[PDB]
Structure 1
Amino acid sequence: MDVFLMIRRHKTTIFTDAKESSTVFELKRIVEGILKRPPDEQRLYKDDQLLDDGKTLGECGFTSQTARPQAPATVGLAFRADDTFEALCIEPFSSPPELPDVMK
């Protein structure tokens, strides 16, 4: 089972997939290959929860049922600039307009 993810930090969102059986650390290797930052400089989150490097994605609650291509599950990412990391900040997307009269 592939799971489909959005790795999000500030205004950056990475679309990627991984095996449910792969670990958080292996996912950290994917983002460093993309965003050029080592795992020990990365923190991955599910909601407000820090994930252990050794845990599988499925153990962290990323399953095919909840991480679908058309509806990926969100991973928070925070970087260690020099020390104490930073607090997780995932910027939300823009707001849709009010439904036009003819659709409401």
Structure 2
Amino acid sequence: MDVFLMIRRHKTTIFTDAKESSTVFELKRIVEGILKRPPDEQRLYKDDQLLDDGKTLGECGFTSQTARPQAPATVGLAFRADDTFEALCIEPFSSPPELPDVMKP
């Protein structure tokens, strides 16, 4: 059972997938390969809830039917500068324009 995720921090979004049996620390490990930051410098989030490095992704909520390839679940990432952990900050995507007239019902 595979979940599909967007790991997001500031203006960065990682499109990756993992298993439900996979754990949050294992997800911090694949972040390390991509962003070159060890897991001890990583805080992961689902909405505003820090994820334990031992909880499986299914326990946090990431299931097959809430993390699909066409609608992937969002995981917040926060890095540690030196001693202090940075607060989670995610810049939103741009907004679409107003719906043109010939497309309005």
* Category of TM-score, reference length = shorter chain: over 0.9
Structure 1: runs of 5 or more not aligned? none
Segments ≥4 residues shifted beyond 2 Å: none
Q: 1:3 corresponds to which residue?
A: 3
Aligned residues: 104
Deviation digits for residues 21-67 of structure 1 (CA, Å, limit 9, x no counterpart): 10000000000000000100000000011000000000000000100
1:59 alignment partner, SS class: helix
Residue in structure 2 matched with residue 90 of structure 1 by the alignment: 90
Output the CA distance in 2 between the equivalents of 1:64 and 1:15.
16
2:41 aligns with 41
CA distance in 2, matches of 1:95, 1:68: 22
CA shift, 1:83, in A, is 1.6
TM-score using structure 1 length: 0.99
What's the secondary structure of 2:103's corresponding residue? coil
* Equivalent residue runs for 1:1-104 within 5 Å: 1-104=1-104
Cα distance between partner residues in 1 of 2:91 and 2:62 = 21
Unaligned runs of 5+ in 2: none
Identity across the alignment (%): 100
Specify the SS of the correspondent of 2:33.
helix
Distance in 1, Cα, partners of 2:84 & 2:63 = 31
Q: Deviation of residue 78 (structure 1)?
A: 0.2
RMSD: 0.4
Query: Following TM superposition, by how much is the alpha carbon of 1:72 offset from its aligned partner in structure 2, in angstroms?
Result: 0.1
Structure-2 separation of matches of 1:24 and 1:90: 19
